[PDB]
Design a binder for these strands. Structure first.
Lengths: 674, 671
RNA sequence: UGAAGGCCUGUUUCCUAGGCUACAUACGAGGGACCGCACCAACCACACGGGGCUCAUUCUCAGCGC
């Protein structure tokens, strides 16, 4: 799509003029503008005179053009300039006089230009520069001056260049400038001269992603990083195939906080390799090939508070990863441990010993040979105040009675996307006196029973999507004990029969999702038994979704006294007949969806009440009757209501009476009908 | 959806899928058909049909009928065809079919007649096609005297017949059976005289009958000395064959023989020596391991043969057809050989095939990758007329590979990995070529002398081949004086010199889609607007879809008086130069869907609209003002042209007061 | 010259991604004889949009070297 039209859509002092194949600078624009998003055009230069119209510009974005030369007069003509952007342009030379007049500049970007060299003090007048960018413009020396300059610099970026080493002298121009992010990623460094980083005033973060490092190189690097204030350090995308004690020997004189080692094919962690980081707090090990772990692998990290292991262990191949017991006895303050995407065979009897502060534990798709959660696979976690356990995608097939007898402090439990297939006798949840949510969606099937949920009265949420439930109509209802339940998602299970005892006593329920369950027959005027009213006394219902159940007649009385309903979704059904006064008690309705039905007439004795305060209505794809007797009131309401109706003009068509087959509803003439 | 009283038609009252329980009577008395298929009827009282004694064929399939009445026949004396499949009948008494005599076809397929003991078909002297397939029978006996004199097509599939007694078939003494279906019956015995007892037997189907070489040997020894012409043996355990396997067939004028789906493993030496009249043979979906020059010995009269998926799979076990394999099939004319794993063609494989005309090789090879000047020496003595060679991963051809097939007409080379510069010598010798199929290859580099050696070409397909070197003078297509179709489509042609297509006076179809030739058409004109459609006066259908066009030059359609279809969909046309279609008066089809057209004026669309039969211009941001669409909307109100999806896909995206307004609903009076 | 880039056009691939189709299979009702219809679900197939990426040959830079 396009419709970029001729002139650019000018807005409130933000004149975006992207993708217009411009060649000149537009001048007609008001003199009160502060922004010029000139991105994505084919300009050749910026004459500093064609901007005399508006000396009110604040930020200039001229990225994605073919600018080859800037002029010093541009700065003085635009004295209120703060941010400049010239990425993906074709500059080649920066003279000593170019940036002389720009002094209110704070951010300056020159990313994909071609400054192969710089030999001057061109940033002298830049006492307000905060974020300087030079990433990917083919440089070969980090030197940008000879005296202490850029006093208030804050975020320097030098990615994708041809820097070969960091001389001690070619960085001394940062004597008293607090660098808070020094990006140097993807620079083929080969040497770190002594004093290379100590010369900077303050250094906080440092990015050396894709810098082709090796253990020797990073050893020299770390020996040159000591005795500074570094706090974040990343080493992604390297050849750090191994580590030992001497690898990070230099880091002992720093208050390091983060350390990223992702994407290194890190193969074997040496014994005590982190003994020198008693302040590390955020560690990553993602996407590597750790073969084994020993109780010395994490020795000394007595102060960690986060750790990721997502895809950290070797692949499946007959080579299988092996984390031996007592591996985490040192991480006495750890609280989060992601362990997704691994191939650990199963949990041993002491794996998580000593983790007396673990709170959040994820295990999504970490196992290959579990298939059964017995009462001993979690004995190692008996001493951890857990608050979450993500266990999706493990091909779990069955659970034993009292597996979770240990996690007496758990809140959320995730069991979705497995092959659980058993009768929930109710003893599986033994001990979870503090459970708060349980996630069972996407399993094979479960056979509920009267005493299934009796052991977890404090439950508050419950998800049973696509689980193909059975034995759902049993008295008393298995849900009766859950006095504190609020959400229910008993959806996409295909429930043929719903005894009306279900949901009795769940007074606190607020969300009920009951889609794709083919409960059609239950609603009937033919009534083998009196029309079911399972929505008996849930007075706290807000959103009730009964979509795609082949409904064709809602009994009168099912919505009686549910005064707080906010959204009703009855889409994808066969409703055509609408009993009078079905929505008499729904006055707070804010959302109503009856799309994709067989409704032919929209009368007032049904839709008045809900229409009285509606904010959003969706009733498209319906064979409306285009006669004033069937739609006159509706069309009037459409003419005089402020409700948000989506796709009004195109998806409200009458399939009758041919004289109007295709006629837009809103266009229906109503005058001569009374 | 829509159900209601069934949609009655001209004396054909279809009332399917209505969950009926009674028989409708309101229907006229001039009806001849009742398609009562797919309902829930329990039975058919022969009195509720008294209304119309004019019925001719009754279709009561897919119901729950449990009993019919003899009075039904006499109440409906003009009944000819009956159908009761997937019903639940259980017993056929001697009096049920007594009054039906004008019956010709009778079907009782999925009923439950576990037994029949009477002469119930006595009054059936007009029965032609009787069906009893899949109703749980255990004896083919249907009577005791010669009955069903004019029977013609008997079916007995999916039953529990265990053998064919000589006596339990004698009720067909003088009835010419022309199709005796017995598929999927676990036969174990063939008593002597089993088939000779029938008057005449022409075809016989024994599909899925669990046969073995011994069983079929006894069968064939009991089939001799009859008039059988077609015989099928699909889906069996015929794991091997020898000379004695078909020893009995020597006394028959057999014509067809199907052996598909048998895991047929090894053809014995001379195993077909007894069929000097076989004319249509099949061997599909088996596991022939090897072929010997004796494998087809004696079949001196064959005229068709399929080998699709006949050879063993890839596994290190590879099929091997040795040389001189077809020296006996001196009258063969068709040979399908799809889906095999023959490594390559030897130097004598097709020797002796001096009558082969149609040869297919679609996906038969695995290790060809190069068609040299010797892979077809074995075909030097065959008047071929087709060669299907798709899906062989061919990578390159040598000069003069086709120097042998001097009588070929159609050549198929699509769906391969051909990647070379067509120097022009590849087609050496094809002085009679008629069509060449090159679509779906890697890429070809054309040259001035590419097609110079095949002047008699008439069709040419170059779809998705990613052409290069297309603008060279003179055009490589210039020599093809007889070309008619061109399909130079989906190749992305940046530059088209206007010399191309000059002299192809006989061209009728040009397909030029998905080629992003946008720039060529331009008013800015680096060079004068290209007019490659210079003098093709025989053009009928011209498809230039999806090329990012935004301005057609004036003069490109001048004097092409026979154009019948123009497809300019999926472009960026918004501006329409006056009088672009002045010479297109015979236009029958016009497609301008999915464009940026905003106004439809008369000085452009008058002429084409004058005689149009079909127009497609949907998905366009029409201007809903009478100045832009008034004439169009009037024409829509007063024209008989076929416009598809008129009422829903012709919406104005302007001027908001009408955003979404159906075009046809646009009021025009006050303009 | 080569190398390098932003502008429009579009070619291929990749999914994701939706809807619609089509197929077997299943849970149900209801009728029925000793196994045929409606609702629903998932399944895979087919057609077509929609989201990323990778090529095209044009419109124009520079930096030259000589």
């Amino acid at each position: 799509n396009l419709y970029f039209q001729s002139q650019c859509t000018v807005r409130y002092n933000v004149a975006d003029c992207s993708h217009l194949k411009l060649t000149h600078i537009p001048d007609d624009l008001p003199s009160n503008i502060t922004v010029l998003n000139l991105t994505h055009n084919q300009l050749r230069r910026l004459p500093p005179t064609n901007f005399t119209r508006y000396s009110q510009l604040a930020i200039l974005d001229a990225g994605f053009n073919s600018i080859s030369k800037l002029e010093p007069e541009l700065c003085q003509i635009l004295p209120l300039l703060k941010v400049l952007n010239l990425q993906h342009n074709e500059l080649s030379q920066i003279s000593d006089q170019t940036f002389v007049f720009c002094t209110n500049l704070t951010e300056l970007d020159l990313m994909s230009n071609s400054i192969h060299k710089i030999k001057s003090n061109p940033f002298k007048n830049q006492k307000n520069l905060i974020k300087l960018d030079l990433s990917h413009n083919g440089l070969s020396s980090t030197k940008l001056g000879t005296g202490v300059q850029l006093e208030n610099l804050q975020e320097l970026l030098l990615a994708k260049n041809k820097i070969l080493a960091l001389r001690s002298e070619e960085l001394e121009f940062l004597g008293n400038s607090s660098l808070r992010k020094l990006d140097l990623s993807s620079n083929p460094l080969k040497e770190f001269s002594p004093g290379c980083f100590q010369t900077i005033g303050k250094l906080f973060a440092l990015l050396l992603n894709n810098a082709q490092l090796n253990p020797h190189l990073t050893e020299k690097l770390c020996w040159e990083l000591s005795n500074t204030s570094i706090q974040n350090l990343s080493l992604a995308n390297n050849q750090l195939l191994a580590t030992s004690e001497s690898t990070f020997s230099g880091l002992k004189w720093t208050n390091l906080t983060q350390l990223d080692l992702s994407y290194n094919n890190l193969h074997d962690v040496g014994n005590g390799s982190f003994s020198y980081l008693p302040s590390l707090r955020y560690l990553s090990l993602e996407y590597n090939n750790i073969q084994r772990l020993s109780p010395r692998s994490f020795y000394g990290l007595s102060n960690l508070r986060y750790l990721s292991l997502k895809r950290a262990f070797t692949k499946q191949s007959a080579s299988h990863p092996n984390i031996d017991d007592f591996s985490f006895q040192w991480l006495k303050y750890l609280e989060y441990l992601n362990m997704d995407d691994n191939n650990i065979p199963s949990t041993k009897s002491n794996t998580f010993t000593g983790l007396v502060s673990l709170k959040y534990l994820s295990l999504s798709k970490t196992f290959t040979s579990l298939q059964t959660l017995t009462n001993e696979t979690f004995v190692s976690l008996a001493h951890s105040p857990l608050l979450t356990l993500n266990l999706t995608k493990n091909h779990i097939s069955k659970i034993a009675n009292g597996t979770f007898s240990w996690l007496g402090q758990l809140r959320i439990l995730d069991l979705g996307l497995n092959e659980i297939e058993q009768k929930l006798s109710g003893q599986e949840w033994r001990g979870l006196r503090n459970i708060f949510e349980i996630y069972l969606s996407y399993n094979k099937y479960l056979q509920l029973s009267t005493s299934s949920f009796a052991l977890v009265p404090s439950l508050q949420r419950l998800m049973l999507r696509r689980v193909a439930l059975k034995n759902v109509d049993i008295s008393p209802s298995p849900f009766r004990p859950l006095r504190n339940l609020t959400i229910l998602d008993l959806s996409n299970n295909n429930i043929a029969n719903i005894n009306e005892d279900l949901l009795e006593g769940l007074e606190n329920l607020e969300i009920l999702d009951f889609q794709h369950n083919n409960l059609a027959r239950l609603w009937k005027r033919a009534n083998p038994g009196g029309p079911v009213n399972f929505l008996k006394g849930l007075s706290h219902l807000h959103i009730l979704n009964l979509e795609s159940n082949g409904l064709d007649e809602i009994p009168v009385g099912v919505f009686k006294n549910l005064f707080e309903l906010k959204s009703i979704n009855l889409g994808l059904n066969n409703l055509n007949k609408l009993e009078p006064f079905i929505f008499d008690d729904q006055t707070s309705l804010r959302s109503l969806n009856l799309q994709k039905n067989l409704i032919t007439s929209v009368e007032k004795d049904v839709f008045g009440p809900p229409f009285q305060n509606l904010n959003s209505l969706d009733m498209r794809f319906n064979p409306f009757d285009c006669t004033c007797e069937s739609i006159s009131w509706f069309v009037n309401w459409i003419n005089q209501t402020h409700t948000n109706i989506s796709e009004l003009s195109t998806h409200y068509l009458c399939n009758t009476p041919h004289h109007y087959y295709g006629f837009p509803l809103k266009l229906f003439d109503t005058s001569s009908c009374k």
